[PDB]
Structure formats: structure tokens, C-alpha cells
Amino acid sequence: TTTATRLTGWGRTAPSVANVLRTPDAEMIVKAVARVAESGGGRGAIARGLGRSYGDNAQNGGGLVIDMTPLNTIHSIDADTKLVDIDAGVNLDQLMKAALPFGLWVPVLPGTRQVTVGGAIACDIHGKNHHSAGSFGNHVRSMDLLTADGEIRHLTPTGEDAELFWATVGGNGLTGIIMRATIEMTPTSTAYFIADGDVTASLDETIALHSDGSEARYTYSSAWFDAISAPPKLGRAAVSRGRLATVEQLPAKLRSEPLKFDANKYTFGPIGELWYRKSGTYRGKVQNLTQFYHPGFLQYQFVIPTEAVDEFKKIIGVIQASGHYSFLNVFKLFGPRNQAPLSFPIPGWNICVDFPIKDGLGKFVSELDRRVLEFGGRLYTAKDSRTTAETFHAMYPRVDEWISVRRKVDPLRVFASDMARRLELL
Ligand SMILES: Cc1cc2nc3c(=O)[nH]c(=O)nc-3n(C[C@H](O)[C@H](O)[C@H](O)COP(=O)(O)OP(=O)(O)OC[C@H]3O[C@@H](n4cnc5c(N)ncnc54)[C@H](O)[C@@H]3O)c2cc1C
Ligand SMILES: CCOC(=O)NC(=O)c1cc(F)sc1NC(=O)c1nc2ccccc2s1
């Protein structure tokens, strides 16, 4: 029934051997969880999606890992209610394609589409539209949760079991296995975006641009920022902002299938500064999803609360002066948070940086953790593999509330992961 497999997260880092159960049969999954519960709990079980977490949240050294990707039935889509009913192994690319002919858009897309619905709920994922749509869990109308006792619980965001619903959102698999969910989609009349592009010369400008009001005009917003240059070039950004196009905004060619989804010597001088400015400045460009959104290393992502703007500028300065060079860097302003205790996003300045593994890096990121903590921010568990229990607990002050929900639903510690043990969420 199960195979011994060396599993890792996407950062190809911290390997651990587990029994991997890979079955299309939901029955077998129920029986395997019963097999784990009866056998004195042991080192437990965790669900796995497409393995796109950089962390260790989808591995369980010496325990059971349940591969959820063969549970990938789309049960129903309804254009009138905007509801899709899917198995938790359905991925967001598959969902996106199935839903478009109904005029329905996946309401939160992350930077990849190769992500399961289960993983999208359990990490409470966010994307380019967070300030207008919130995160994934805001759009879940119901889910079916396989709990430790072997019962499948039907959960909704309001009414009884709300607490457990909200513990499962961002719960990293630790309340049990999400089998099935109903999601409310966003109505759209096209597969396209109308996009504006802006380019700033400085961090001060980047911040000014993001707090001048203009963010209200766009449903989707994010930036690539410079993390290497000295100040005041540092934190200069290519900003890309837009919204879903309506049919009347498309060039005539596209109106018949509006829902179809099918170095050099100059580059470091003044001319390329102009090139990159021109090329990155535009208004009302029509773009598909690939052009607008989806075109060794240690990923590190954090958010600093909105008011702590001076503290945010200080952390960027520390990154640049550190001697650790990050080329691919995403900046976004998050909007309001939801009610999930372990949900990562909070209103404020979100950054994802990417460091090549060098001497000293492990210790440098520890200092960064400390600064993020002091400034009221937190790290994202989907990107993290190395932070301590202490640091994590102080960054998520609702963790105790969460833990008691978890102990209520899982008394025998039937659901467990490397991360759980490391972060003392067990
Ligand atoms: C290139 C790239 C870009 C990314 N961009 C973004 C982004 O823009 N925004 C963002 O928020 N995230 C982003 N991520 C992270 C990714 O969205 C999350 O890590 C997502 O959770 C991965 O889903 P997955 O199905 O691979 O789940 P896995 O990585 O396999 O599992 C992740 C967690 O979900 C739990 N889980 C999975 N399935 C189930 C289930 N059926 N029931 C209960 N728990 C389950 C696992 O136990 C584990 O805790 C990115 C990742 C990559 C590689
Ligand atoms: C590749 C898609 O890029 C985007 O447009 N991203 C966003 O808009 C966007 C907005 C946010 F709030 S968080 C985010 N993206 C991320 O967190 C990514 N992390 C990686 C790591 C490796 C490769 C690609 C990515 S994208």
C-alpha cells in the first residue's frame, strides 16, 4: 500500500524518508488514517499536495505522507452560484481551465498554478490581488475534513465548527486531511487583463507610489524591486498593476473567444536605464495570464505592518549591505487580514527575496528573523525551513488559541509533520 520515499520541499532542502501512500481511492485514505490512530499514534501522518512548499510542512520523516494528487475530480461548476465543488487534489491550473468556459476566475492565484486546492487552503495562499480579494481561505464556502477519529467533518466559515474551519485555513495540514471543498469563484467575462506599468527610481518612490491612493484603482498589484544597488537606487521597482478586462476593452481579434487561454554593451549604462524605464512604463496594455502574472537557493518572505514604514526601509537597507545578493525580488502591499489564527498575511509591506547559499547566510537570516519579529512582522511557513519555535510563536501571537483547537480535534497527535515538530505546533 505504501512506499519508502526520500521527500523534500521545493527548495530541494532538508531531506527526510517517509512511507508515501498514493491512492485515487478515498476509502484507502480513511483506512490508513485509522491504521495510524490505532497503532499508538507513532510519528503520525501528513497530507502532501504538489510539493511546492519550500518548507518541511509536507514531509514527515519516519511517518506517513499521504499524496493527495490522485484525488483530482472536479465534481461540479455552476455559473449561477459561482460555486465549484472539487477534490482537494485538484490543482489550480486544472481548475482555472475547467472554470473559464463558465465565465469563472480562480479568485486567488499565487505565482505558480502548480498548487493543489488542499495546499492552497492549508497555507492560506495569497497573490497579486490580496489587497482586493484577501487570501484563498476567504473564498472557501465549505470543506470536508478527515479528522483523527476517522470522521469526515463538513466545515463552514460561519455557524458551528467555524473555529475548526478557521484553524484549518493556514493550518499546514495539522487539523487533518482536506478531502473536498466548495469555492466561490470570481465572475469574469474575459481571460485577459488591462495593465498599467510604472517604474520608480528609489525605495522612497516605491513606498510613495503604494500609499498615494492609486492602489484602490487596481484589483491586481505587485513589483519587482532592486535589492542589490546602493541607496538611493536601492528599492527602485518595476510595478505592474491591473484588472480583469471586459469584452468591450479587447481588440476585435480577441472578442470572438474572450475566455480562451491557449547582457550586452548597453545594459549597465544610461541607455538601458532609459530602455528599462520606457519598456516598463505603459497604460492599458492588454495581457493574458502568462504576460501579466505567470511568465541552491533560500527563499525568504516576510511582511512588516503598514505603519512601520521606517522600519521596513531599514530592513531593506540591511539586506543590501549584507553581501548576500538577491536578484528575483517581489514586493506587494497586503490589504486586510482574515480570521485564521496562523494566516500569514497582515496589512503591510510584503517581500520575497531569494538568496544563493553562501557561508554566513544561515546566521544572517537569523538576524533578519529578529528584525522582522521586533518590527511586528512575521515569516511565511510555505517559504521557511530554518526559523525556531520561539521566533514563530512570538510572530503569531494567536498560536496558543490555534493549538488548543488542534488538541481538541487531534488528541493523540495523529497528524504530524517535520515543521510541526520544529515549530512546536504538535
Ligand atoms: C514558484 C513558486 C511560486 C509561489 N508563489 C506563491 C505566492 O505567490 N503566494 C503564496 O501564498 N504562495 C506561493 N508559493 C507557495 C505555494 O503557493 C504554497 O506552498 C502551496 O501551499 C503549495 O501547494 P502544494 O499543493 O504543492 O502543497 P504542498 O507543498 O505539498 O503542501 C503544503 C502544505 O499544505 C498541506 N496540504 C496539502 N494538501 C492537503 C490536504 N489535502 N489536506 C490538508 N492539508 C494539505 C500540507 O500538509 C502542507 O502543510 C509558491 C511556490 C512556488 C514553488
Ligand atoms: C512568477 C510570478 O510573480 C508574481 O507576479 N508574483 C506576485 O505577484 C506575488 C505577490 C505577492 F504578494 S507574493 C508573490 N509571489 C511570490 O511570492 C513568488 N515567489 C517566487 C519564487 C520563485 C519564483 C517565482 C516566485 S513568485
How are beta strands 140-146 and 177-184 bridged, if at all? antiparallel
How are beta strands 16-22 and 64-67 bridged, if at all? parallel
- Is 194 annotated in a binding site? The answer is no
Cα 16 to ligand 1 centre (Å): 18
Q: Which residue has the cell 478515498?
A: 26
How are beta strands 297-305 and 378-379 bridged, if at all? antiparallel
Asked if 170 contacts 122 with a C-beta cutoff of 8 angstroms, the reply is: yes
Q: Could you tell me the residue range of the domain that residue 269 belongs to?
A: 1-426
DSSP state of 4: E
Shortest-distance atom of ligand 1 to CA 9 = 29
To one decimal place, what's the resolution in Å?
A: 2.3
Helix/strand/coil for 98: helix
DSSP element (H, E) containing 68: none
What does the longest C-alpha to C-alpha distance in the chain come to?
Answer: 69
Q: Please, what is the end-to-end C-alpha distance for the chain in angstroms?
A: 26
What's the domain count of the chain? 1
Phi first, then psi, for residue 45 (nearest 5°) are: -145, 145
Asked if 37 contacts 414 with a C-beta cutoff of 8 angstroms, the reply is: yes
DSSP element (H, E) containing 374: helix 361-374
Helices 361-374, 309-321: axis angle to 10 degrees equals 170
Dihedral angle computed from the Cα positions of residues 379, 381, 382 and 383, in that order, rounded to the nearest 10 degrees: 50
119, with CB counted inside 10 A (0-12, 13-18, 19+), is buried
Q: Which residues precede gaps in the chain, with C-N > 2.5 A?
A: 262, 295
> How far is Cα 362 from Cα 125, in angstroms, rounded to an integer?
26
Q: How far is CA 385 from CA 97, 119, 147, 362, in A?
A: 32, 17, 26, 11
Helix/strand/coil for 356: strand
Q: Which of 5, 20, 53, 383 to mutate to test the pocket of ligand 1 (most atoms within 8 A of CB)?
A: 53
Q: What is the number of other CB atoms lying within 10 angstroms of the CB of residue 225?
A: 22
Asked if 195 contacts 282 with a C-beta cutoff of 8 angstroms, the reply is: yes
Q: What is the number of other CB atoms lying within 10 angstroms of the CB of residue 247?
A: 12
Alpha helices in 293-329, H assignment, sequence order = 309-321
Q: How many helices (H) and strands (E) does the chain have?
A: 13, 19
Asked if 378 contacts 344 with a C-beta cutoff of 8 angstroms, the reply is: yes
Cα 415 to ligand 1 centre (Å): 17
**Is the distance from the beta carbon of residue 125 to the nearest atom of ligand 1 less than 6 Å?**
yes
- Which residue type does 297 have? F
Alpha carbons within 13 A on the beta-carbon side of 226: 21
> Across-strand partners of 353?
300
Alpha carbons within 13 A on the beta-carbon side of 402: 24
Asked if 21 contacts 29 with a C-beta cutoff of 8 angstroms, the reply is: yes
Cα 37 to ligand 2 centre (Å): 38
- Is 116 annotated in a binding site? The answer is yes
Compute CA 65 distance to the chain's CA centroid, rounded to the nearest angstrom: 21
Q: What is the number of other CB atoms lying within 10 angstroms of the CB of residue 351?
A: 24
- Which residue type does 293 have? Y
Asked if 197 contacts 285 with a C-beta cutoff of 8 angstroms, the reply is: yes
How are beta strands 237-244 and 192-199 bridged, if at all? antiparallel
